[PDB]
Ligand binder design. Sequence first.
Ligand SMILES: COc1ccc(Cl)cc1NCC(=O)N[C@H]1CC[C@H](n2c(=O)[nH]c3ccccc32)CC1
Ligand SMILES: [Zn+2]
Length: 208
Amino acid sequence: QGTILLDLAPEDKEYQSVEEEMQSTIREHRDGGNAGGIFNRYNVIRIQKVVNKKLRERFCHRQKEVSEENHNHHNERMLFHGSPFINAIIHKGFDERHAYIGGMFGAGIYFAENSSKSNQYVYGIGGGTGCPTHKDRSCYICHRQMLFCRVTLGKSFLQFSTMKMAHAPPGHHSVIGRPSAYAEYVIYRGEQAYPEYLITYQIMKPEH
Ligand SMILES: COc1ccc(Cl)cc1NCC(=O)N[C@H]1CC[C@H](n2c(=O)[nH]c3ccccc32)CC1
Ligand SMILES: [Zn+2]
């Protein structure tokens, strides 16, 4: 009924395909390391596959609808997502009703193709006050989690200066803003994203 969390063996080509994609999409943010911490590699502690029947079905029904609307192209893309509700999301799925009106591009769910970008969001906007135990945004101790999800983009609307919209523009199914820089993929329907992989990891202090 609920969600089954499956561990992936590090020697499974599937584990390797996800960690490789997480480690390789690390980038410099002209941050100084403030939001997500100072690092240039993660210690991937665990990769779990999130299996939930109802979520898959809601997600596949919507993906069909979007195909119909976009010349049989649902445009599925694997994307990272970071935020403080990861546990809630893996059990009940993505939910736009918990989406923040004020967001740069509206009340949607945000995704990035760069792992170092979603890591900045693990403990809230800008990385809030860091980890709960150490009030440190660059904690090398506490374990963090992020999601690598299948995101049904359908036809993406390229917006390029803020517009706080509540739904994708007419005829589109997603929004891509290029903030200052990097890209933000936004959806306004929980069922357009499926949280495929749950990743437990730590940022690692720079070597010396
Ligand atoms: C709500 O506004 C935010 C608060 C903190 C961060 Cl770090 C990012 C955002 N907006 C971007 C974004 O993508 N936020 C998502 C985060 C998960 C949220 N979420 C969900 O999809 N299912 C949920 C179930 C319970 C609580 C939150 C949930 C919806 C909005
Ligand atoms: Zn900590």
